[PDB]
Design a protein around this nucleic acid. Structure first.
Lengths: 164, 191, 122, 35, 138, 117
RNA sequence: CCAAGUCUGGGCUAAGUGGUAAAGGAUGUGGCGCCGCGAAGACAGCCAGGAGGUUGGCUUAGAAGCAGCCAUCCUUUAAAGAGUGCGUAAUAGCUCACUGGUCGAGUGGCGCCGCGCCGAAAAUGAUGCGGGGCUUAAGCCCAGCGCCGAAGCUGCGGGUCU
RNA sequence: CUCGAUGUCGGCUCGUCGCAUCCUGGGGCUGAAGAAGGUCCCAAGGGUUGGGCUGUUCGCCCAUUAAAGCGGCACGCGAGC
RNA sequence: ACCGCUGAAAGCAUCUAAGCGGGAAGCCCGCCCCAAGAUGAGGCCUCCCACGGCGUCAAGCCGGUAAGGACCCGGGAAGAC
């Protein structure tokens, strides 16, 4: 039960939903094992089960959709924290070049779609087009570089804490 | 023919800087017989006679560059194998024959107080009571001397022509001088 | 070479004479004490109580073995004898002095200490 | 850990189902409940 | 149901050794209690115990009453080996006739004692049934 | 390649059961059934434990051996062949049936492949 | 595989349970009763003050809910908090056990069940009997329907003793 | 079942499974910083040493080591000692 | 095992049923060693050409083709034969 604001070109064929937009050129999939919902100026959930089970099944799609959109129009952002009294980073090459001891930093690449940013060496973060494909990779590096909370330092999901 | 190969020269070491023993290997270009491809259908080996004079007494790089020498007319000088390299060779065991479970297969024999007792050579046992008759496990006097032996990390040091021949890093060609040697540097690790 | 209870004299003065070879030092398996190597044996007998004393738990190394040592120099070397030197956990001799020569070796596996004390290192 | 016999620590430690499996969860290394 | 040799020739006339009945406190209505369904020469000891640990965790008002009590017993190894077995006693109890009035957590509003007994069941052995009485438990 | 047109069939979706069942059925009587489809095929949901059982055909290796095919092709091999015995006819009855992957002549593609497909 | 309904009816399984196991667990799932409310516009979102005499007794060197043994009451007022809770040396912050605007139509609780997942580790190699089977797949429960199948019982005919 | 007979302890050799795993990797836990330990979940590949004294296994002792495993199969093996 | 992402049913959370990834001396592959007698006898190249007379679907009896092979001899780290 939602919307499809400005530009959300929508094509639901075979079970795939093709969503074209601004900086959100995206082609996602969407179950044939249920009921589609689209009307050119809105859209929503289809009850191919109406029953608790599948109920949620779409009770998820809903979001799903919600994603396509917000994703197709305004892309996503993951806020990362560079907390290292030694570690540090600042883009380099078509990827990131973080560092945190060891000896060999590392170059990480946001394959077509994903795209990282070095607002300022210390902190960084990613802006993709699919919260999905984002949060993941976004993190897949947030760890990539041990956050070790033994006493405070390392890559950490924005809004963390400490320890003892 | 996908590879490169010839026979055992022999062994001897000598020189270097610390010194080192290898082995000699004979083989110019033993001509080029067709070439491997399973195209349009089943393709593998042809034969547009162009061989020796006797032979009718019995009448994609590796293989590729081949095309280079196998279409030249037949032969194909050996030696990309250059200065400091790792092919691999597959000798032919050595008519050693049918022997006792002794050398054939590592094993301790007739001990002392009975390590002689006109006693001696002969395995210890087979299978328990309940288990079941026998296993295809424990080898046996599994003849040897004929095995299609070979190995790995086969480093070649140098070569020269006067007679197309190769010098080797540690021999153990398996089979004996005048023997059938085929080399390669397969999935090398020292790479 | 040189294990179980093969015996070998001293060349240093630690206060020894000869020593039985318990273990070849290094790690599991292993079956051999070849000069440079380090042995886990004891006194078969030692002077009149210099400082060591007969039957004393010990630690010694390799420097004289008629087993013949093949020098990377495709060369060959051996001795009329088989014995070595005691040591202080810290691969460090005791004998204040040396005796029969020895072989580069040592150096290669740490010991100078004797390396030079030695009357002659072959 | 306890594989067998898990039942709610912290006044939160949740009840989750992974692989039909039931493994305790709650904001504490001191709860890593699993069976 | 093998039982013993007689009430005064083999082993009959004891105190069975245990820790008496009543505990907790009164209570006119509130029916708070425990019973079973399992059959078993209720493991004396195990028994005695159990119930007790019950008080161990509570203390005062909650009919810590309990309507059980063994009074016969088994026997086994003593003498030759396995054959013609004489008899050496040990371990009396009582048949928990496939369920019945166990002990009572009886009192007005004092679940602080219900949980107790509860702790009492946990223990025990043969499963146990958690229940209430005429009215329930308040 | 090309053959007759005797037992002209295929596969896909259906229930990888009675499926073969008759296959033979006519596998018996005295007929040749050359079809194909493998992948398309079908069989019990519970994929997972789905791909297990037949991986039980997978590494079921007994010194004495115990291959256990690794392409749809088989799956049907077993099964079917299962329907029959092993004296003459049966046997032959196993040469008389034949299937294949995509298409040579005018959930059933995962367990295999999975364990070999 | 081997003869006989991939019968029909209406439930229940989403683990291959079926194809061995107990105590002991858990908003699994499906069907039954209870306490409180949604126009004192309800549980989990969000704005805010997160009340005072409560800082009582053993031990105090520290109970002063947030060491533990006993209390469990009073209040001026929007009600309450015998202050269940993370702590520190006791004190010192948050958290509901409280409700306005913005939502708005079903939200939390225990008893009764029928199905089901962790506990449940083994020695040659693997197992429903085998191939196999997930709303006739098939399992399991309750309903009607017709076919199989003994040397048993009818038909055929002979045998034989009382 | 076997007395018209299955030759029994330990050793030797040749081993083969198994996992409740000793060494070994992977993990989560800790009253874990490091390092090293403890706790428990996943994995058997490979591997898991010389002597001593004892008929012994077991076991204690000596020097190692990453380690110096528990147990199957008539507590495997006498038509093999 | 073990760790995460995207998100239902529980309008708040959740590695989760469905969607996507992380992660082991371990499985599969890869590296060597066979090996279609795997009766599903596999591929391919390079040779040989239609001989005789007899009743038959004579797919049966003879010269053959050194294509070709053999046997006997002489020899081999090939080897009991």
């Amino acid at each position: 039960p939602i919307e499809i604001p400005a530009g959300v070109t929508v094509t639901v064929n075979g079970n795939t939903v093709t969503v074209k937009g601004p900086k959100g050129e995206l082609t996602r999939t969407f179950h044939p094992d249920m009921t589609i919902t689209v009307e050119g100026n809105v859209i929503t959930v289809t009850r191919p089960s109406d029953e608790k089970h599948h109920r949620a099944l779409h009770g998820t799609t809903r979001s799903l959709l919600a994603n396509m959109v917000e994703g197709v129009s305004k892309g996503y952002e993951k806020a990362l924290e560079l907390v290292g009294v030694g570690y540090r980073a600042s883009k380099q090459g078509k990827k990131l070049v973080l560092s945190v001891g060891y000896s060999h930093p590392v170059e990480i690449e946001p394959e077509e779609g994903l795209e990282i940013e070095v607002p300022s060496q210390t902190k960084i973060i990613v802006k993709g087009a699919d919260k999905q494909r984002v949060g993941e990779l976004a993190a897949n590096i947030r760890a990539v570089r041990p956050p070790e909370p033994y006493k405070g330092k390392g890559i950490r999901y924005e809004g963390e804490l400490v320890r003892l | 023919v996908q590879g490169f190969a010839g026979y055992k020269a022999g062994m001897t070491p000598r020189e270097g800087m610390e010194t080192v023993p290898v082995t000699v290997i004979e083989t110019p270009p033993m001509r080029a017989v067709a070439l491997r491809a399973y195209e349009q259908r089943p393709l593998t080996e042809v034969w547009t006679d162009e061989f020796h004079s006797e032979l009718d007494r019995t009448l994609s790089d590796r293989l590729d560059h081949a095309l280079d020498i196998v279409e030249d007319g037949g032969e194909h000088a050996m030696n990309i194998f250059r200065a400091g390299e790792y092919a691999d060779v597959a000798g032919v065991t050595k008519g050693k024959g049918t022997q006792g479970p002794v050398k054939r297969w590592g094993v301790q024999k007739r001990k002392g107080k009975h390590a002689r007792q006109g006693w001696r050579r002969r395995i210890g046992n087979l299978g328990p009571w309940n288990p079941s008759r026998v296993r295809s496990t424990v080898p046996q006097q599994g003849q040897t001397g004929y095995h299609q032996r070979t190995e790995l990390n086969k480093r070649l040091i140098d070569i020269g022509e006067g007679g197309p021949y190769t010098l080797v890093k540690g021999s153990v060609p398996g089979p004996d001088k005048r023997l059938v040697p085929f080399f390669r540097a397969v999935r090398p690790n020292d790479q | 070479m040189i294990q179980q209870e093969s015996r070998l004299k001293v060349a240093d003065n630690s206060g020894a004479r000869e020593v039985l070879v318990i273990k070849v030092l290094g790690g599991s398996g292993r079956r051999y004490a070849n000069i440079g190597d380090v042995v886990v044996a004891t006194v078969k007998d030692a002077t009149p109580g210099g400082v060591v004393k007969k039957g004393q738990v010990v630690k010694a190394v390799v420097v004289r073995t008629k087993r013949g040592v093949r020098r990377p120099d495709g060369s060959y070397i051996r001795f009329d004898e088989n014995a070595c030197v005691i040591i202080r956990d810290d691969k460090s001799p005791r004998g204040t002095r040396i005796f029969g020569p020895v072989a580069r070796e040592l150096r290669d596996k740490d010991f100078m200490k004797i390396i030079s004390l030695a009357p002659e290192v072959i | 850990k306890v594989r067998s016999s898990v039942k709610k620590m912290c006044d939160n430690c949740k009840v989750v189902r992974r692989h039909g499996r039931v493994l305790v969860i709650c904001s504490n290394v001191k709860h890593k409940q699993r069976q | 149901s093998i039982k013993p040799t007689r009430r005064e020739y083999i082993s009959g006339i004891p105190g069975k050794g245990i820790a008496q009945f009543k505990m907790g406190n009164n209570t006119y209505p509130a029916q708070v209690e425990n019973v079973v369904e399992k059959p078993v020469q209720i493991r004396h000891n195990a028994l005695e115990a159990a119930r007790n640990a019950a008080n161990r965790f509570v203390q005062n008002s909650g009919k810590f009453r309990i309507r059980k009590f063994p009074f016969h017993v088994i026997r086994e190894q003593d003498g030759d080996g396995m054959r013609a077995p004489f008899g050496k006693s040990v371990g009396t109890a009582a048949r928990s006739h496939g369920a019945n009035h166990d002990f009572i957590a009886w009192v007005n509003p004092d679940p602080a004692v219900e949980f107790a007994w509860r702790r009492a069941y946990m223990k025990v052995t043969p499963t146990v049934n958690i229940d209430s009485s005429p009215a329930g438990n308040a | 390649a090309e053959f007759d047109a005797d037992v002209i069939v295929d596969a896909r979706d259906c229930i990888m059961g009675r499926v073969a069942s008759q296959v033979a059925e006519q596998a018996l009587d005295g007929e040749t059934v050359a079809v194909v489809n493998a992948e398309r095929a079908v069989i019990t949901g519970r994929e997972e434990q789905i791909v297990e059982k037949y991986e039980k055909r997978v590494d079921i290796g007994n010194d004495n051996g115990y291959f256990y095919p690794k392409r749809p092709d088989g799956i049907f091999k077993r099964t079917i062949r299962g329907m029959l015995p092993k004296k003459q006819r049966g046997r032959e009855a196993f040469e008389s049936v034949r299937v294949y992957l995509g298409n040579p002549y005018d959930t059933l593609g995962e367990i295999s492949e999975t364990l070999g497909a």
